[PDB]
Amino acid sequence: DYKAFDPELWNAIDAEAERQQNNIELIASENVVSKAVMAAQGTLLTNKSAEGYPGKRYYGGTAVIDVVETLAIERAKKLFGAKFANVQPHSGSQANAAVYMSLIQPGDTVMGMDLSAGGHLTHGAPVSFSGKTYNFVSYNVDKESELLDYDAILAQAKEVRPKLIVAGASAYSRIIDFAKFREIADAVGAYLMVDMAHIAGLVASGHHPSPVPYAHVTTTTTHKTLRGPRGGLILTDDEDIAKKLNSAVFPGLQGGPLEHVIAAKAVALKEALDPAFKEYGENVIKNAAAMADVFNQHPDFRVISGGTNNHLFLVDVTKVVENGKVAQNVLEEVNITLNKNSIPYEQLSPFKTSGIRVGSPAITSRGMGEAESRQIAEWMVEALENHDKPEVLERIRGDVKVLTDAFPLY
Amino acid sequence: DYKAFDPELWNAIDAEAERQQNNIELIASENVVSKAVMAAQGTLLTNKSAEGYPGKRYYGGTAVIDVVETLAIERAKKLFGAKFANVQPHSGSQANAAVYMSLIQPGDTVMGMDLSAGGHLTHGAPVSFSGKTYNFVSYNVDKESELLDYDAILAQAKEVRPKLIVAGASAYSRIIDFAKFREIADAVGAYLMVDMAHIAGLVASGHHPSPVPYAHVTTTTTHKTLRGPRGGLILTDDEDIAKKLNSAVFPGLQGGPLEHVIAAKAVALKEALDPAFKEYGENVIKNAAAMADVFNQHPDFRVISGGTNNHLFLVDVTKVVENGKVAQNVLEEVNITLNKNSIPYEQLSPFKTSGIRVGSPAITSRGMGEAESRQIAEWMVEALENHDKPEVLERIRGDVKVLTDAFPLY
Ligand SMILES: *[C@H](N[C@H](C(=O)O)[C@@H](C)O)c1c(COP(=O)(O)O)cnc(C)c1O
Ligand SMILES: *[C@H](N[C@H](C(=O)O)[C@@H](C)O)c1c(COP(=O)(O)O)cnc(C)c1O
Ligand code: NA
């Protein structure tokens, strides 16, 4: 029994297992993976150096590795309807770096969604390799509707003439029109890359239209709504782009891939291919709308864009508490975790923000329904309204514990 | 029961466990990690997004994650004697990229060891981001001795004027003088980076001199001789460099770290801090030298630099078989896996090579000693000498199964 050797590490792991059980997880990026996904990434596949690609490895004794990686590739292709897939990127960020490396050059102009409106760090932040290598120029949402305006974006693309347009977001509640993004790209001879990290599970379940037919390349995390292990994935229908993508991932950016994690990708993709996964996506949408509807109806809260068609939404909380940061800290005291989040045209410090971001996937994976989602959102309103009344927080904490005890994590 | 849901995947994982058991693994980069290491990266730590650093995370619910990551940081600093450690890099390649991003700017001149004498792809290959982003100039070993010639490297550095010198290798058998590399760097006003991936377990065991007091920045994999999970690690004594490295890893190059893998790093680093790790390192050295001695004494084979003072060595096989690829294929027939390898000043195609690379770490971790290591190298000589006699290969394959049955993998 190995755990007696290292009690400080194994006690910390027991403490994190207890924190996840005793926590209402509303961070829109989080999920609860299956025991099968965890077991695959705890295998002796970690021992094998798999530099290269199936049948084209730097080393031998890789014929079983090749079967595992090919299952992950074949499942990604089947699940997303893509002719090519690369399952080696270590993360979403590495996936994105490989696509930029394949399609554009340093100094090339790129349009990505503004970081205040849900663009990722890797879509042009100045502190990211993305903004350091490439000239990123943001598009935003409409100032009043807080929706993407495909006319304003086309007009801006004709001025900017980007080599590449990046679509996809971390904090956008509405359906992104990939057919329109491809039209905008075509009108200026740009590539279109879609980073579907937040929405890949909903793409896989049928609850969000797929970018895969419209983007020259689609990137995603295997984690978030897809409910996989942490890692990246790249999809394309173009055979010449596929060759470039493969070279960019290895030996361009990475070395040996994590074949234990790729086994876990292959596990998670077979789960998403199952009819049960459609049911998962349905509850994800229902649960998110139920929570959004509680803030919509309360007069002291505005849901950004007025609602959600996906797993998440933002709330301006500044009427009820000073900033998103305070909202986060308060809800932490009743064992509800979400994050402070900038809202569109954020006016406060990015360290404070006006917003909270809420998602349904993790509570949905714990088997919660619209009733429990509505209930969680009522608790959130009540904790924020009573942020200075310690014995009200005390009481919500107790009510939360009855709910978590009722929906065991594992 | 989860295995019943996906037999194709779980059959392949069971087959890799049995393949690792029934094969003699001599790939110098491979090892057999502990049950504790595999179990740690199979935990529900994969469900927690930990963007940022301990005490300074993007999201809440990270209090326990911070204890796990801080354990990995403190155990790295203690084991390698460094004032700072970063345990987030997904891989050795991502570690190296963050160091270049910290110390130099695109187009700067870098010296790195020649890919034929053991330099990694990330040490300037033109197919790597390293050779595409930076102006790499390679240094070699001496043609006659096959040893690093620190006077010749000094004279080249004074001509080339690098901003950065990278030392460390994947096919060099002799003790590196890190004090000499830092004297060379200081003589030309360059940074010294040491990638100690191959030798890190021998630096930990006390069998190889540490680069940590001499390199501005030390990179490593947590896998290979250190016997950790697949990932990377960065060390420095310089507080200003540490702040740059941290910002380069995240948000510079990566997003969210793999905290389940970081738990596994913490497990491995505590294993390497144990007095039994010194005995491992001693057996690694003795077992590699017992294999090298078989090839040294045999007239048809030559060991690159005449032997080894670490875990690996290279053998020119071209008097017995056409090329290293042939030698790798023949040994695979008798369930011995190693890799063809370029030898210094390699004349054949890089796809063929003159050489094989042999390491001791995997067989040492299985409990094998010097008598087993010698028997293994006698079987390699016999199989290469008798490559065209199927009845000989059949017999060695049967003798190899008696040896693997006697030293079970787990
Ligand atoms: C995930 N980013 C999440 C989010 O949900 O806000 C937080 C953790 O930043 C993400 C990624 C992540 O790539 P990683 O695996 O390197 O961390 C990439 N792309 C998008 C769109 C995204 O939401
Ligand atoms: C590992 N290179 C080895 C080798 O043994 O030849 C094989 C596995 O390519 C290695 C790395 C690898 O980084 P990774 O985690 O990105 O694959 C980095 N640096 C050195 C010196 C090294 O040997
Ligand atoms: Na190592």
GROMACS .gro file of N, CA and C in nm, chain B residues 344-397:
model
  162
  754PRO      N    1   2.798   1.007  -3.342
  754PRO     CA    2   2.859   1.136  -3.376
  754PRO      C    3   2.919   1.128  -3.519
  755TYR      N    4   2.901   1.231  -3.599
  755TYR     CA    5   2.955   1.246  -3.737
  755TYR      C    6   2.893   1.136  -3.824
  756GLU      N    7   2.770   1.098  -3.789
  756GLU     CA    8   2.691   0.993  -3.859
  756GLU      C    9   2.699   1.015  -4.010
  757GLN      N   10   2.738   0.910  -4.083
  757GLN     CA   11   2.751   0.909  -4.231
  757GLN      C   12   2.623   0.852  -4.296
  758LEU      N   13   2.548   0.764  -4.229
  758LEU     CA   14   2.431   0.703  -4.297
  758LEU      C   15   2.310   0.795  -4.285
  759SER      N   16   2.203   0.759  -4.352
  759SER     CA   17   2.075   0.835  -4.344
  759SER      C   18   2.029   0.839  -4.198
  760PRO      N   19   1.967   0.951  -4.154
  760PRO     CA   20   1.911   0.958  -4.020
  760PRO      C   21   1.801   0.854  -3.993
  761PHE      N   22   1.739   0.801  -4.100
  761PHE     CA   23   1.632   0.696  -4.095
  761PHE      C   24   1.695   0.558  -4.074
  762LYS      N   25   1.825   0.544  -4.100
  762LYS     CA   26   1.896   0.415  -4.089
  762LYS      C   27   1.989   0.421  -3.969
  763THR      N   28   2.088   0.512  -3.976
  763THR     CA   29   2.188   0.540  -3.868
  763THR      C   30   2.287   0.425  -3.862
  764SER      N   31   2.401   0.449  -3.798
  764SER     CA   32   2.506   0.350  -3.770
  764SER      C   33   2.486   0.285  -3.635
  765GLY      N   34   2.391   0.332  -3.553
  765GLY     CA   35   2.400   0.302  -3.410
  765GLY      C   36   2.276   0.241  -3.350
  766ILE      N   37   2.293   0.182  -3.232
  766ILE     CA   38   2.182   0.158  -3.136
  766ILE      C   39   2.211   0.235  -3.007
  767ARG      N   40   2.104   0.280  -2.941
  767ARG     CA   41   2.116   0.344  -2.806
  767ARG      C   42   2.053   0.247  -2.707
  768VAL      N   43   2.126   0.219  -2.602
  768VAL     CA   44   2.089   0.127  -2.493
  768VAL      C   45   2.087   0.204  -2.361
  769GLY      N   46   1.977   0.193  -2.288
  769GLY     CA   47   1.976   0.235  -2.147
  769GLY      C   48   1.937   0.127  -2.047
  770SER      N   49   1.986   0.146  -1.925
  770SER     CA   50   1.964   0.062  -1.805
  770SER      C   51   1.845   0.102  -1.719
  771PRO      N   52   1.778   0.220  -1.729
  771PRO     CA   53   1.684   0.256  -1.621
  771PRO      C   54   1.561   0.163  -1.603
  772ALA      N   55   1.496   0.121  -1.711
  772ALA     CA   56   1.376   0.035  -1.704
  772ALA      C   57   1.411  -0.100  -1.644
  773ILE      N   58   1.518  -0.165  -1.692
  773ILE     CA   59   1.553  -0.300  -1.639
  773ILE      C   60   1.596  -0.284  -1.494
  774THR      N   61   1.668  -0.179  -1.458
  774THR     CA   62   1.705  -0.151  -1.319
  774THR      C   63   1.579  -0.136  -1.235
  775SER      N   64   1.479  -0.062  -1.282
  775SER     CA   65   1.357  -0.043  -1.201
  775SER      C   66   1.284  -0.178  -1.181
  776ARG      N   67   1.300  -0.274  -1.272
  776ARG     CA   68   1.238  -0.408  -1.262
  776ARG      C   69   1.314  -0.497  -1.161
  777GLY      N   70   1.427  -0.451  -1.109
  777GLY     CA   71   1.505  -0.523  -1.008
  777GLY      C   72   1.624  -0.596  -1.069
  778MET      N   73   1.653  -0.580  -1.197
  778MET     CA   74   1.766  -0.653  -1.259
  778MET      C   75   1.901  -0.594  -1.215
  779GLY      N   76   1.999  -0.683  -1.197
  779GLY     CA   77   2.136  -0.649  -1.158
  779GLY      C   78   2.234  -0.670  -1.270
  780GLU      N   79   2.362  -0.670  -1.237
  780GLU     CA   80   2.471  -0.671  -1.337
  780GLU      C   81   2.473  -0.804  -1.412
  781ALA      N   82   2.436  -0.916  -1.351
  781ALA     CA   83   2.445  -1.048  -1.417
  781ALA      C   84   2.335  -1.052  -1.523
  782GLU      N   85   2.218  -1.004  -1.487
  782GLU     CA   86   2.105  -0.994  -1.585
  782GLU      C   87   2.142  -0.896  -1.697
  783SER      N   88   2.202  -0.782  -1.665
  783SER     CA   89   2.234  -0.678  -1.767
  783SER      C   90   2.334  -0.740  -1.863
  784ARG      N   91   2.437  -0.809  -1.812
  784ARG     CA   92   2.538  -0.871  -1.900
  784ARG      C   93   2.470  -0.976  -1.990
  785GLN      N   94   2.385  -1.061  -1.933
  785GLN     CA   95   2.315  -1.169  -2.011
  785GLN      C   96   2.236  -1.102  -2.125
  786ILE      N   97   2.164  -0.993  -2.093
  786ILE     CA   98   2.086  -0.917  -2.194
  786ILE      C   99   2.178  -0.872  -2.307
  787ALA      N  100   2.291  -0.809  -2.276
  787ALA     CA  101   2.381  -0.762  -2.383
  787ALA      C  102   2.443  -0.882  -2.459
  788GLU      N  103   2.467  -0.996  -2.394
  788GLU     CA  104   2.518  -1.117  -2.467
  788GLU      C  105   2.410  -1.161  -2.566
  789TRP      N  106   2.281  -1.159  -2.525
  789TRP     CA  107   2.171  -1.196  -2.617
  789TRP      C  108   2.163  -1.098  -2.734
  790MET      N  109   2.196  -0.970  -2.712
  790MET     CA  110   2.187  -0.870  -2.822
  790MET      C  111   2.299  -0.901  -2.923
  791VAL      N  112   2.421  -0.925  -2.876
  791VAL     CA  113   2.537  -0.963  -2.962
  791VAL      C  114   2.500  -1.089  -3.043
  792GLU      N  115   2.452  -1.192  -2.975
  792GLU     CA  116   2.414  -1.323  -3.035
  792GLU      C  117   2.302  -1.302  -3.140
  793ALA      N  118   2.198  -1.227  -3.108
  793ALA     CA  119   2.087  -1.202  -3.204
  793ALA      C  120   2.138  -1.123  -3.324
  794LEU      N  121   2.224  -1.022  -3.305
  794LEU     CA  122   2.271  -0.944  -3.422
  794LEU      C  123   2.366  -1.032  -3.507
  795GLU      N  124   2.453  -1.110  -3.444
  795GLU     CA  125   2.550  -1.200  -3.511
  795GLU      C  126   2.473  -1.306  -3.590
  796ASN      N  127   2.356  -1.347  -3.544
  796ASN     CA  128   2.279  -1.461  -3.597
  796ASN      C  129   2.144  -1.411  -3.648
  797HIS      N  130   2.142  -1.289  -3.706
  797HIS     CA  131   2.019  -1.217  -3.747
  797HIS      C  132   1.945  -1.301  -3.851
  798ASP      N  133   2.015  -1.386  -3.926
  798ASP     CA  134   1.952  -1.462  -4.037
  798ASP      C  135   1.924  -1.605  -3.992
  799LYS      N  136   1.946  -1.643  -3.868
  799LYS     CA  137   1.910  -1.780  -3.822
  799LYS      C  138   1.786  -1.778  -3.734
  800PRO      N  139   1.665  -1.793  -3.792
  800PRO     CA  140   1.541  -1.795  -3.715
  800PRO      C  141   1.542  -1.885  -3.591
  801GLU      N  142   1.608  -2.000  -3.597
  801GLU     CA  143   1.613  -2.096  -3.484
  801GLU      C  144   1.694  -2.033  -3.369
  802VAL      N  145   1.795  -1.950  -3.397
  802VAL     CA  146   1.872  -1.881  -3.287
  802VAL      C  147   1.781  -1.774  -3.220
  803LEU      N  148   1.717  -1.689  -3.300
  803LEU     CA  149   1.629  -1.581  -3.251
  803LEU      C  150   1.517  -1.643  -3.170
  804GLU      N  151   1.469  -1.760  -3.212
  804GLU     CA  152   1.358  -1.829  -3.145
  804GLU      C  153   1.406  -1.870  -3.007
  805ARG      N  154   1.528  -1.922  -3.000
  805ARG     CA  155   1.586  -1.961  -2.870
  805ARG      C  156   1.609  -1.836  -2.782
  806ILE      N  157   1.665  -1.729  -2.836
  806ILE     CA  158   1.690  -1.610  -2.748
  806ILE      C  159   1.554  -1.561  -2.698
  807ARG      N  160   1.454  -1.557  -2.785
  807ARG     CA  161   1.319  -1.512  -2.746
  807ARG      C  162   1.271  -1.599  -2.630
   0.00000   0.00000   0.00000
